[PDB]
Design a protein around this ligand. Structure first.
Ligand SMILES: [Mg+2]
Ligand SMILES: [Mg+2]
Length: 267
């Protein structure tokens, strides 16, 4: 809706947060590129797992083997294309995190007095849903339960009925899917490439699935080769204007994603 230049973003740290290259993953697919920001504060062990799997090279060539319109695109089944079970352990479910409301502060969408058991907002460009902050007054850890809801753009971990079976398979959220919330380990967000995810070939499985051609951690690239990503600061005034413009009656998943931009290197 609004295009932001690299110059305008770099000059304005009040409104733009630079993404850590070790939190930035490039998924090159047969429908285009997806840039994912990892969310270590939301799912620390899953974020470590994704870095680990990416760095094995084993995601390369994995299919998007389960793609459901209006839901998600699932990929990352290494065994299916490697031809053998990979040397890879499962990761325990991380469906919620314990948030300190004095430390990790959500930007609310509506400033009106809250009256529900839960609310949503943004932190570092990630959508967040939470139990009420007032519970932290008396909880044993002075924290409250929060999670990253499965809005379009979120990236999460596939699993079986076993909550600890997440390992390699992931899904790219194509549409708001709140029935997944608190049941699947969301761990990242597509800064760019939601449209790419929404274009992956549908099927269970597709006859001829799209492919995750390569995955790269940006921190593993030489400095001059690194794309540079920025995410609008939810607590800054440009985001206030964005909410004004888009509608503050909307829940976090009915808004667009937090404005984000990825700039690739010159030749
Ligand atoms: Mg769709
Ligand atoms: Mg409250």
């Amino acid at each position: 809706m609004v295009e932001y230049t690299k110059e305008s973003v770099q000059a304005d740290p009040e409104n733009w947060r630079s993404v850590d290259p070790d939190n930035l993953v490039i998924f090159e697919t047969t429908k285009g590129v997806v840039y994912i920001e990892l969310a270590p504060e939301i799912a620390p062990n899953h974020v470590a797992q994704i870095r680990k799997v990416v760095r094995t090279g084993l995601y390369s060539g994995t299919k998007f083997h389960r793609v459901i319109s209006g839901f998600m695109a699932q990929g990352g089944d290494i065994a299916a294309t490697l031809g053998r079970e990979p040397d890879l352990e499962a990761v325990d479910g991380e469906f919620v995190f314990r948030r300190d409301p004095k430390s990790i502060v959500l930007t609310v969408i509506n400033e009106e007095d809250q009256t529900k058991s839960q609310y949503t907002g943004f932190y570092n460009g990630f959508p967040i849903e939470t139990r009420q902050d007032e519970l932290a007054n008396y909880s044993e850890d002075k924290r409250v339960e929060s999670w990253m809801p499965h809005c379009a753009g979120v990236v999460s971990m596939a699993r079986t009925n076993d909550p600890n079976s997440g390992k390699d398979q992931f899904f790219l959220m194509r549409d708001e899917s709140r029935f997944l919330d608190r049941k699947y380990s969301s761990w990242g967000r597509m800064l760019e490439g939601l449209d790419v995810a929404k274009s992956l070939t549908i099927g269970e499985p597709p006859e001829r699935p799209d492919i995750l051609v390569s995955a790269v951690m940006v921190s593993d690239l030489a400095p001059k080769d690194r794309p540079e990503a920025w995410v609008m600061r939810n607590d800054g005034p440009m985001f206030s204007l964005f909410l004004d413009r888009m509608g503050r009656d909307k829940d976090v998943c009915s808004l667009p994603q937090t404005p984000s931009v990825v700039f690739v290197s010159e030749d």
